[PDB]
């Protein structure tokens with residue numbers, strides 16, 4: 001099992017670069033956790049989704065999607081584990097093949113009241129987006 | 139003979155990998171998915187889907203159906219053998235073929251629909267059911283029913299076959315289905331009796347909607363076909379169910395049973411005695427800690443109500459008339475489709491379990507059927523797997539020999 005260093009989904013994560021977000025080149029079979037950590041500032045509320053290129057580019061989500069992470073529990077760590085491969089328990093098309101690109105964003109603004117926001121949010125204001133260039137040579 | 143329940147003097151269960159039903163040149167250039175298997179005594183009905191290397195994002199060559207026999211292999215293990223395979227042309231338009239086996243016929247209930255996501259992107263007006271009937275040394279027969287013409291006990295937007303398998307009883311075929319209800323007929327769903335939160339009941343109700351069907355409740359149903367003819371849809375008891383999902387109606391010593399994959403908060407194993415098949419009423423069984431990998435919201439072993447739609451299908455089979463001893467191949471993982479384990483279990487305890495071959499890179503759908511063979515208890519499992527880091531995607535098959543003598547399990 002090859003475990004890639006986890007991504008902490010919060011606003012202090014310097015791995016989200018201006019204009020680019022977080023870009024990686026996972027290989028098929030690699031594992032990676034995305035983690036919304038519990039409270040020790042305040043807890044940051046997010047729904048984190050897989051989206052297509054167009055949506056990631058525009059920091060915009062549509063209703064026809066289901067969170068990979070619903071970070072709405074201050075009292076406990078919430079972890080999503082990706083294995084970069086064809087098969088998973090996800091029933092809405094999460095699936096990874098070599099030489100393809102995949103996208104994860106949140107358009108939540110970090111507050112409880114902005115949890116379900118569909119446009120902008122931290123994808124825009126913090127470049128909190130992940131580009132996964134699967135099975136590729138960077 | 140009675141199956142052994144005590145494995146103190148049974149350090150090893152004997153099992154054998156058995157070959158797939160065909161081999162071809164450049165089989166490794168095909169992505170073979172979604173194995174569905176039902177075995178009754180010496181016969182089996184089997185279906186899988188064959189694609190190009192891109193799997194469901196590429197071309198579908200076959201919705202491949204077969205009716206075959208169980209015969210002895212070189213180490214006296216039961217093996218599956220079939221000579222004739224069948225597929226529709228334009229296989230991409232044929233979905234969710236669901237098998238039933240009898241001594242003289244293999245039956246498959248399929249849905250024809252041009253959409254790739256028929257449950258959520260089509261309705262009764264643009265879907266057609268097809269019952270495929272296979273017989274030994276005879277031509278295939280196909281009996282069809284436009285979905286609009288089906289008699290239903292509730293109003294549905296759409297209905298699809300539920301894939302895992304069905305059973306023949308009372309002169310009828312019973313296939314599990316999944317449907318989207320026109321009206322909100324689930325009003326008091328089964329939920330956790332001792333609530334974890336003040337909003338459990340809300341979560342239990344909301345669990346019947348999903349991204350594909352945000353306004354229509356998704357439920358289990360069955361399609362009963364007589365004189366395979368008359369066709370009827372019977373809706374599951376809506377006070378005693380879980381959100382509609384890939385399922386199997388199977389036999390345990392001539393009585394009907396349900397396995398329902400867990401897509402909801404209720405991630406624990408869902409197996410029931412079907413106490414009235416024509417009213418689809420259930421008695422859910424207690425189980426040990428057997429579940430399935432999920433996502434972040436409903437990982438393996440979640441038991442408190444919440445709203446999610448995730449999980450794998452990993453069915454079971456009863457070794458006793460009393461339904462107090464079962465086998466399964468389950469995925470021992472919180473969130474990843476990997477690490478299949480064979481397990482023998484009572485309603486209260488896992489009695490023996492072990493991981494299968496280390497070279498399995500991933501595993502998703504699994505199914506298992508048991509039968510008497512040479513006066514011995516055997517089970518065959520079909521595992522939807524990959525090998526070599528997704529280079530080779532096609533199912534594997536195992537035969538498990540279950541002992542009846544706890545002192546001396548395996549003679550010779």
Ligand SMILES: *[C@@H]1O[C@H](CO)[C@@H](O)[C@H](O)[C@H]1NC(C)=O
Pocket residue numbers: 109111113114115117
């Ligand atoms: C987040 O969005 C909500 C809803 O628009 C708003 O009420 C809230 O003040 C926003 N919070 C920010 C930008 O910090």
Ligand SMILES: *[C@@H]1O[C@H](CO)[C@@H](O)[C@H](O)[C@H]1NC(C)=O
Pocket residue numbers: 144145146147
């Ligand atoms: C199972 O068999 C072993 C060996 O005979 C014995 O130690 C144990 O008590 C048995 N367990 C039962 C009957 O539950």
Ligand SMILES: *[C@@H]1O[C@H](CO)[C@@H](O)[C@H](O)[C@H]1NC(C)=O
Pocket residue numbers: 190191192196
């Ligand atoms: C599979 O998809 C890849 C990339 O999208 C493409 O290059 C290839 O032609 C497809 N495979 C086929 C047609 O066998």
Ligand SMILES: *[C@@H]1O[C@H](CO)[C@@H](O)[C@H](O)[C@H]1NC(C)=O
Pocket residue numbers: 251252253259260261263264
């Ligand atoms: C079936 O009909 C509905 C409307 O009646 C339509 O929205 C849907 O796209 C159709 N699906 C197919 C596969 O033709």
Ligand SMILES: *[C@@H]1O[C@H](CO)[C@@H](O)[C@H](O)[C@H]1NC(C)=O
Pocket residue numbers: 333334335336
């Ligand atoms: C269960 O629900 C009742 C009714 O809302 C509530 O009084 C009780 O606190 C709940 N129990 C929990 C959350 O453990």
Ligand SMILES: [Cl-]
Pocket residue numbers: 350351352353354
């Ligand atoms: Cl809907």
